[PDB]
PDB file of N, CA and C and ligand atoms in Angstrom:
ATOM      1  N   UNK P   1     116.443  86.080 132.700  1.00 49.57           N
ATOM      2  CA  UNK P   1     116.778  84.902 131.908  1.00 49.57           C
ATOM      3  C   UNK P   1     116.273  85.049 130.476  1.00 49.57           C
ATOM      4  N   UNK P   2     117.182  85.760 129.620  1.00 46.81           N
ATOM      5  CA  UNK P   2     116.760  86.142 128.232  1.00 46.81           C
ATOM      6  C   UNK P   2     118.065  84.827 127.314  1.00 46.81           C
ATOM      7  N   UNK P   3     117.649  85.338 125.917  1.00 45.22           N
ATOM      8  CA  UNK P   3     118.530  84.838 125.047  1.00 45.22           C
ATOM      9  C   UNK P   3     118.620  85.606 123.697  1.00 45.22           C
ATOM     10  N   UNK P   4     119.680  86.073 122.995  1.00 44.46           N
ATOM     11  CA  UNK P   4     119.682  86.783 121.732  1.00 44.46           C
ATOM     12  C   UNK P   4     119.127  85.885 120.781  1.00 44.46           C
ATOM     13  N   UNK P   5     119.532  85.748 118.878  1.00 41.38           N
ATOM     14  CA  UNK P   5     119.394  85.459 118.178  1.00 41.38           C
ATOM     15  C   UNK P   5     120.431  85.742 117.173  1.00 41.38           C
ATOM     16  N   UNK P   6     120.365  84.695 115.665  1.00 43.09           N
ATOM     17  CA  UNK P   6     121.366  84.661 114.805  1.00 43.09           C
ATOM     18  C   UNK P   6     120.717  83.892 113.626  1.00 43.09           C
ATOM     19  N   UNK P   7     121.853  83.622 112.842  1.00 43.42           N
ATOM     20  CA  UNK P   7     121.543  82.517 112.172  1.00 43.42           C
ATOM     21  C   UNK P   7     123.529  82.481 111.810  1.00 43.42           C
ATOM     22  N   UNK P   8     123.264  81.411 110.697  1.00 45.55           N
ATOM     23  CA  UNK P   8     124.479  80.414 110.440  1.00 45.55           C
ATOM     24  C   UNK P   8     124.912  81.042 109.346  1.00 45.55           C
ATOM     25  N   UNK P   9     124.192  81.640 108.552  1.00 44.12           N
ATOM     26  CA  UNK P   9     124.932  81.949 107.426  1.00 44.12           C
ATOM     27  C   UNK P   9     124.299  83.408 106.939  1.00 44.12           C
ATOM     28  N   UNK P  10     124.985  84.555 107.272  1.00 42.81           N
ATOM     29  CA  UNK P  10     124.932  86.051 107.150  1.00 42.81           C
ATOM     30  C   UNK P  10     125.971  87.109 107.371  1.00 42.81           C
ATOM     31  N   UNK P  11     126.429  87.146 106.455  1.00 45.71           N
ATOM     32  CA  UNK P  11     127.770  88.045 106.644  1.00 45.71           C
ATOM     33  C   UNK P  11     127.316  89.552 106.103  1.00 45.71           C
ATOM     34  N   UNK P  12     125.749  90.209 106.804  1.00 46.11           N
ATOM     35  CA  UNK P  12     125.473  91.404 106.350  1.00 46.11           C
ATOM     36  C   UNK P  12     123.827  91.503 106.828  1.00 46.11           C
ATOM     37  N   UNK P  13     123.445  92.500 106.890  1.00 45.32           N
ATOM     38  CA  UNK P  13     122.097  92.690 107.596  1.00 45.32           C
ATOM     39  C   UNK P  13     121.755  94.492 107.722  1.00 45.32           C
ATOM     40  N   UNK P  14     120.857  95.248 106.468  1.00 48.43           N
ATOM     41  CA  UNK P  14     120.841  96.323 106.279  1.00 48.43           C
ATOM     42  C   UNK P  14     119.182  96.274 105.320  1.00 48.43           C
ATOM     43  N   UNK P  15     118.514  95.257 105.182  1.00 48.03           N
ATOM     44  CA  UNK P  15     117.052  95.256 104.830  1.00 48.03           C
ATOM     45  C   UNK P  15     116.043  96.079 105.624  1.00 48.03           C
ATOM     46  N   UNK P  16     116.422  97.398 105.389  1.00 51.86           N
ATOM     47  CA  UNK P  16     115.280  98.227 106.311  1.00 51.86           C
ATOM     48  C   UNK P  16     115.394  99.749 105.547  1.00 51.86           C
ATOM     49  N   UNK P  17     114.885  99.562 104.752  1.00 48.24           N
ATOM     50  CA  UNK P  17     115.159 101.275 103.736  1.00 48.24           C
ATOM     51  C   UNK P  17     114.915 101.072 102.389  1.00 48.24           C
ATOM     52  N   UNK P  18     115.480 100.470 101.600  1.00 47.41           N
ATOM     53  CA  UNK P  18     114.894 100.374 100.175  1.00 47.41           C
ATOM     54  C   UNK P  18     115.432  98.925  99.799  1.00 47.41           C
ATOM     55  N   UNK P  19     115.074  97.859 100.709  1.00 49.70           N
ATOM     56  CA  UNK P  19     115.182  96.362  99.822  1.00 49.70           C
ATOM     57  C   UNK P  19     114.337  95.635 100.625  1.00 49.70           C
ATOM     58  N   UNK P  20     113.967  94.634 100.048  1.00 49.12           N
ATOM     59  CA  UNK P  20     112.459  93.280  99.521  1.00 49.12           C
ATOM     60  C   UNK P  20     113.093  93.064 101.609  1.00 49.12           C
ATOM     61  N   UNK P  21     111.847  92.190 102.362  1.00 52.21           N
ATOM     62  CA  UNK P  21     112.679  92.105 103.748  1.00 52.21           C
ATOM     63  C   UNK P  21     112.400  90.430 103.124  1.00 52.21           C
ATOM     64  N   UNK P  22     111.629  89.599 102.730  1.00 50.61           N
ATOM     65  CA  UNK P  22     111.559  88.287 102.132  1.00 50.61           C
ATOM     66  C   UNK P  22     112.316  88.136 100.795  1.00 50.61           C
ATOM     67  N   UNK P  23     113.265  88.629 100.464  1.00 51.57           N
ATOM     68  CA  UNK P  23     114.233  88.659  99.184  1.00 51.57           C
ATOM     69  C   UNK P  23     115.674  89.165  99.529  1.00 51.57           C
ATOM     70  N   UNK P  24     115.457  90.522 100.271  1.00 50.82           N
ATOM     71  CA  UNK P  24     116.055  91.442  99.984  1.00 50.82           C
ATOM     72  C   UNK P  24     116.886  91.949  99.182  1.00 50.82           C
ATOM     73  N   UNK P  25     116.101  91.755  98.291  1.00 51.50           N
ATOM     74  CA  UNK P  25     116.452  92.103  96.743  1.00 51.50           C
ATOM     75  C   UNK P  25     116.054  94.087  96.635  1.00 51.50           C
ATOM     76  N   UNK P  26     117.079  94.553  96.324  1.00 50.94           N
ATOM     77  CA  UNK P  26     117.486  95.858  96.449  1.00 50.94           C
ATOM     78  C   UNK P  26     116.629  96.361  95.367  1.00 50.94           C
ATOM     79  N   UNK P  27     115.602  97.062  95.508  1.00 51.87           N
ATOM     80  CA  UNK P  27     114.444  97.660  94.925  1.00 51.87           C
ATOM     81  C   UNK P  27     115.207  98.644  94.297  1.00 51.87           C
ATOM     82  N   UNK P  28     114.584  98.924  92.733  1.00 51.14           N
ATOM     83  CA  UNK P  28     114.820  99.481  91.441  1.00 51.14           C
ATOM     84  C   UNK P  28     113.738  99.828  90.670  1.00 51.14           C
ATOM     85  N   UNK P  29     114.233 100.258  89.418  1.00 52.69           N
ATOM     86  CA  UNK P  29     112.990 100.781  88.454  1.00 52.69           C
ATOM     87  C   UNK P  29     112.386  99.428  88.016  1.00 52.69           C
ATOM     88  N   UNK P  30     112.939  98.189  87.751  1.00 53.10           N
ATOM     89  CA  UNK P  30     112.346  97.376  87.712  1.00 53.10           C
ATOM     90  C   UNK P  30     111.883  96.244  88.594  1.00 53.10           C
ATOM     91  N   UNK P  31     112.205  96.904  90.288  1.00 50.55           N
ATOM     92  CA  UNK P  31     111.766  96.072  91.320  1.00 50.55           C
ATOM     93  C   UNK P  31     110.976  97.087  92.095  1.00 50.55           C
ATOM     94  N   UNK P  32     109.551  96.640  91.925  1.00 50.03           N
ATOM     95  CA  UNK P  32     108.555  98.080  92.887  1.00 50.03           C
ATOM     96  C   UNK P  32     108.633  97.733  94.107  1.00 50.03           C
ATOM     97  N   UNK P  33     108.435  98.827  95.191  1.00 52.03           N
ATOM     98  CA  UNK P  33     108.708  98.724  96.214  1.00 52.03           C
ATOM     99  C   UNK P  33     107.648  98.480  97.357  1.00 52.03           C
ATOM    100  N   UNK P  34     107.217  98.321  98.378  1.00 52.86           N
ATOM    101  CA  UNK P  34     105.925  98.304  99.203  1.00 52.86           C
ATOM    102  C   UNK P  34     106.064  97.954 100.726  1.00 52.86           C
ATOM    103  N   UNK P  35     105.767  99.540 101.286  1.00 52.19           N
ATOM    104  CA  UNK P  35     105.671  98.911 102.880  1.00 52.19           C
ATOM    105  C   UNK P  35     104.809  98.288 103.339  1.00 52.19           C
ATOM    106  N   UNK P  36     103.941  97.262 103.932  1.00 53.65           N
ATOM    107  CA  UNK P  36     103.219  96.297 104.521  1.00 53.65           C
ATOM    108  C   UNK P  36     102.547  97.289 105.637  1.00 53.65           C
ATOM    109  N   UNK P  37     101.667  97.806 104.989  1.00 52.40           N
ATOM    110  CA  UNK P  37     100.599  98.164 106.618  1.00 52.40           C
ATOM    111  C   UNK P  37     100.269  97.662 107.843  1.00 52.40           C
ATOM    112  N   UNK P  38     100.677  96.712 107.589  1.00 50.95           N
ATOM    113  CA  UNK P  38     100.209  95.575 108.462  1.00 50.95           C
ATOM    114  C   UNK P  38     101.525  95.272 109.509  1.00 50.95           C
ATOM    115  N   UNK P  39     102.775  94.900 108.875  1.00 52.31           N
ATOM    116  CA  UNK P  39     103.662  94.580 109.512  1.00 52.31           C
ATOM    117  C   UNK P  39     104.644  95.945 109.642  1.00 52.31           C
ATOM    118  N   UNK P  40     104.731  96.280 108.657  1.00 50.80           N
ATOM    119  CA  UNK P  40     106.021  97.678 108.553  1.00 50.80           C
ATOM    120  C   UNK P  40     106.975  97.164 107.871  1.00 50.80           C
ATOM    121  N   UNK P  41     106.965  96.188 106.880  1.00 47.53           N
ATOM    122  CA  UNK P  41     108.334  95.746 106.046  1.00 47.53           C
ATOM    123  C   UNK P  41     108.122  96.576 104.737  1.00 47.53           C
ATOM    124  N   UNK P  42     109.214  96.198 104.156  1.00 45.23           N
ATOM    125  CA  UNK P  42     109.175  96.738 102.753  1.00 45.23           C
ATOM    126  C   UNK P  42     109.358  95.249 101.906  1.00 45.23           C
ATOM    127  N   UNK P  43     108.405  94.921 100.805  1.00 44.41           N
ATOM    128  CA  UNK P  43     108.752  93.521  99.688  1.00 44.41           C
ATOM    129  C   UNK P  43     108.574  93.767  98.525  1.00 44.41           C
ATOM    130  N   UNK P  44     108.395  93.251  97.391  1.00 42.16           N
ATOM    131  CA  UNK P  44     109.144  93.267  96.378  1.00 42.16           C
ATOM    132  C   UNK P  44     107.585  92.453  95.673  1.00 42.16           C
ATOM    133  N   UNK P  45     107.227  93.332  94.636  1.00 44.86           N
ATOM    134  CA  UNK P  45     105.936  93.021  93.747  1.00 44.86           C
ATOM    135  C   UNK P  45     105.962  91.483  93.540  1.00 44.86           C
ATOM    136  N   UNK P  46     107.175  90.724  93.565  1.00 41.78           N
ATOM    137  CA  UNK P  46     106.953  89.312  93.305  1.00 41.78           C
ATOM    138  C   UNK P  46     106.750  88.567  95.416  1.00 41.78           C
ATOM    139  N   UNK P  47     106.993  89.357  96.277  1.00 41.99           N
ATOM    140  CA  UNK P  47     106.959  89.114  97.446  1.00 41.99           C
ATOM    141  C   UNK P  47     105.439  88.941  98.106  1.00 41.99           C
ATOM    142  N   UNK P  48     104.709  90.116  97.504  1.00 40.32           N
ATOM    143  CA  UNK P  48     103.306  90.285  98.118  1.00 40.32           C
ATOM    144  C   UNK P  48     102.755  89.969  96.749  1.00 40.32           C
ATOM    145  N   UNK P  49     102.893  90.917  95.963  1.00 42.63           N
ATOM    146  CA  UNK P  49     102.066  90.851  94.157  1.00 42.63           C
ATOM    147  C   UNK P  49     100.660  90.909  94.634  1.00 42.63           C
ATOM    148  N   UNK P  50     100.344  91.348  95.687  1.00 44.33           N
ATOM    149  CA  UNK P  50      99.014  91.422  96.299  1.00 44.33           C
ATOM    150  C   UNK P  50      98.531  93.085  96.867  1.00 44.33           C
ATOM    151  N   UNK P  51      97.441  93.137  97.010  1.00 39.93           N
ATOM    152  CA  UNK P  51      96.894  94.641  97.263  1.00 39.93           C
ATOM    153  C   UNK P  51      95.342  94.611  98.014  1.00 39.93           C
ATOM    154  N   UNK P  52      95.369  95.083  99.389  1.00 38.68           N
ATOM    155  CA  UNK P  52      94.165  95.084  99.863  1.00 38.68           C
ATOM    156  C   UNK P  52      94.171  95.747 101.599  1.00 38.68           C
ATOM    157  N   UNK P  53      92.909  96.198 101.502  1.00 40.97           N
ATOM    158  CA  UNK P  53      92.878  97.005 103.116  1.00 40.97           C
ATOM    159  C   UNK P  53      93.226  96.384 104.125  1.00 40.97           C
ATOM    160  N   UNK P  54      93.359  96.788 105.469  1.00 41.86           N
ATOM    161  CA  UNK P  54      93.632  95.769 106.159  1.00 41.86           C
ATOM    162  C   UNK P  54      92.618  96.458 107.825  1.00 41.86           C
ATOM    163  N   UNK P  55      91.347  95.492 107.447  1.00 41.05           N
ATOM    164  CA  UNK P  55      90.768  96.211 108.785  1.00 41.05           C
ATOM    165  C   UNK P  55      91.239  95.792 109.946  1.00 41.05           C
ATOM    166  N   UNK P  56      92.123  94.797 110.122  1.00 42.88           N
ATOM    167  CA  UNK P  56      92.915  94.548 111.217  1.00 42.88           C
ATOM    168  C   UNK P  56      93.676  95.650 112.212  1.00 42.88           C
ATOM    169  N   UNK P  57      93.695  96.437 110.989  1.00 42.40           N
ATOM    170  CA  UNK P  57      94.860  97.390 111.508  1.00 42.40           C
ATOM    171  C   UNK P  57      93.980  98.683 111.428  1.00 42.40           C
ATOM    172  N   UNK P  58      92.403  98.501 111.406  1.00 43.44           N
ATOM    173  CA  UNK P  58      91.630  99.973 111.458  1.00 43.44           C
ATOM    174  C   UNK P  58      91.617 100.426 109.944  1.00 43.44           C
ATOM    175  N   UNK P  59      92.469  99.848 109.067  1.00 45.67           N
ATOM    176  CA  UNK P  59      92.498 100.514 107.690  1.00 45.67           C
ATOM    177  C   UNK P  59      91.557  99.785 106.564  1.00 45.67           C
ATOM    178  N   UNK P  60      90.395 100.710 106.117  1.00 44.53           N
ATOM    179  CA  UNK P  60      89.267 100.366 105.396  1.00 44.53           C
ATOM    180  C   UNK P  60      89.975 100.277 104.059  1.00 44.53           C
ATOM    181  N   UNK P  61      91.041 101.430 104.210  1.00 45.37           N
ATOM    182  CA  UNK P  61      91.488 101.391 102.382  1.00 45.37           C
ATOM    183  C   UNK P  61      92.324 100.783 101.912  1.00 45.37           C
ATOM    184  N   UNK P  62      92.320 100.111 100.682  1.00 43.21           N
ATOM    185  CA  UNK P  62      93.275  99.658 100.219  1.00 43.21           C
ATOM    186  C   UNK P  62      94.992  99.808 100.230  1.00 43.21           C
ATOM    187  N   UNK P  63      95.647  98.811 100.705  1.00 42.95           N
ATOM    188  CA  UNK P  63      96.941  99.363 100.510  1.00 42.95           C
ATOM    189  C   UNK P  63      98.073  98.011 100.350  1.00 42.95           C
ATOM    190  N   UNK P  64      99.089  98.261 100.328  1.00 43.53           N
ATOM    191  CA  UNK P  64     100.489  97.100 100.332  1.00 43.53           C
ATOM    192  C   UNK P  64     100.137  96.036 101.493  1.00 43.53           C
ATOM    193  N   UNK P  65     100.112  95.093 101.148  1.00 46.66           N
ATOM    194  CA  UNK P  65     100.066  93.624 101.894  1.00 46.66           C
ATOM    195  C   UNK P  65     100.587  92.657 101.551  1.00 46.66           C
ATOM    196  N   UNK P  66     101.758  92.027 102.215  1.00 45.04           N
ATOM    197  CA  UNK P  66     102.487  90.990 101.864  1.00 45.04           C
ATOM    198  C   UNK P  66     101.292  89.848 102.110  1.00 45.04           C
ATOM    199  N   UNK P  67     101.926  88.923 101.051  1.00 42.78           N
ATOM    200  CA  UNK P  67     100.703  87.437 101.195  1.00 42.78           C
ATOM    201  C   UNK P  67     100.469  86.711 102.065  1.00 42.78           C
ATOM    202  N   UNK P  68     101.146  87.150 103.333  1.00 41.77           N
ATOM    203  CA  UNK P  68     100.834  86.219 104.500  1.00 41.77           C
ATOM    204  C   UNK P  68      99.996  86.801 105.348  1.00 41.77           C
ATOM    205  N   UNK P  69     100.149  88.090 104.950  1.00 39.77           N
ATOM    206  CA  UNK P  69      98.968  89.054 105.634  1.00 39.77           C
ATOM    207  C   UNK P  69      97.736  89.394 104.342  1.00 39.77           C
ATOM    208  N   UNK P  70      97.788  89.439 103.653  1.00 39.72           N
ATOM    209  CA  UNK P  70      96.751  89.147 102.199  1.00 39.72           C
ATOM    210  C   UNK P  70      95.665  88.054 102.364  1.00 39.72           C
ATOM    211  N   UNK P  71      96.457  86.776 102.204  1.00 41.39           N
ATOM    212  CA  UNK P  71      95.742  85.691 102.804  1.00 41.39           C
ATOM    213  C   UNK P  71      95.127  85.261 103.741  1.00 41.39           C
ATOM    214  N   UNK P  72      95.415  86.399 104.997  1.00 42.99           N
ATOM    215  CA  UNK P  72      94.733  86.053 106.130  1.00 42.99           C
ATOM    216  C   UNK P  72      93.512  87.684 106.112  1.00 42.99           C
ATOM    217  N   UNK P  73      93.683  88.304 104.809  1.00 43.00           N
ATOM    218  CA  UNK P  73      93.171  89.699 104.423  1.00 43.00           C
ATOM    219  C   UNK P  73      91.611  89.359 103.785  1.00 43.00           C
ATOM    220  N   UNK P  74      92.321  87.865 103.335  1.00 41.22           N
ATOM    221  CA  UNK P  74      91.229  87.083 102.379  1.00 41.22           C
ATOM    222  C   UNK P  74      90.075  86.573 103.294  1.00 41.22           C
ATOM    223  N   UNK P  75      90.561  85.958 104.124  1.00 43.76           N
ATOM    224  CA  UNK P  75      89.965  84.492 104.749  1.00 43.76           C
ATOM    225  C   UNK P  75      89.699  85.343 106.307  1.00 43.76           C
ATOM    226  N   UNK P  76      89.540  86.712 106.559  1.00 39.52           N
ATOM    227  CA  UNK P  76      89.279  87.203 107.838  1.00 39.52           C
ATOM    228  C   UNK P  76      87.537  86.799 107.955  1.00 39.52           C
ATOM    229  N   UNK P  77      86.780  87.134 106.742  1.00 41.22           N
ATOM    230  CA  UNK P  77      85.575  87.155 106.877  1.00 41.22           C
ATOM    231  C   UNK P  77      85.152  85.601 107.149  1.00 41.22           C
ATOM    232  N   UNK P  78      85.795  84.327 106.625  1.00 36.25           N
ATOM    233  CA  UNK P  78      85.597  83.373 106.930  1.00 36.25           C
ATOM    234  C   UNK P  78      86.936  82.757 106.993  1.00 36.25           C
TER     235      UNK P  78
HETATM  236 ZN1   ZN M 101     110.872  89.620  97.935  1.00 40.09          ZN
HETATM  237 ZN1   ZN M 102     102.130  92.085 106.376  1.00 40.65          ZN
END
């Protein structure tokens, strides 16, 4: 007893290679690009505009973090 998924308005779905996955705004020289350590997406400097390790994921060093994982990057220690 499963069920798929959709939505109402999408006539296209190819955000997995070089565009924003919260925009998907097709990354360029003037759109930087960033996979999410954390999740595995790719977003868009105005998407995350954020930068930090993620010991969640074992990783001490700094790297790409979208802000929903940033913010919780922030607020892990308290
Ligand atoms: Zn974006
Ligand atoms: Zn993330």
């Amino acid at each position: 007893s499963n069920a798929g998924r959709s939505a109402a308005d999408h006539w296209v779905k190819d955000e997995g290679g070089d565009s924003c996955s919260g925009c998907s705004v097709r990354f360029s020289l003037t759109e930087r690009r960033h996979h999410c350590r954390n999740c595995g997406q790719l977003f868009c400097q105005k998407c995350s505009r954020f930068q930090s390790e993620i010991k969640r994921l074992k990783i001490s060093s700094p790297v790409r973090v979208c802000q929903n994982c940033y913010y919780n990057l922030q607020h892990e220690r308290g």
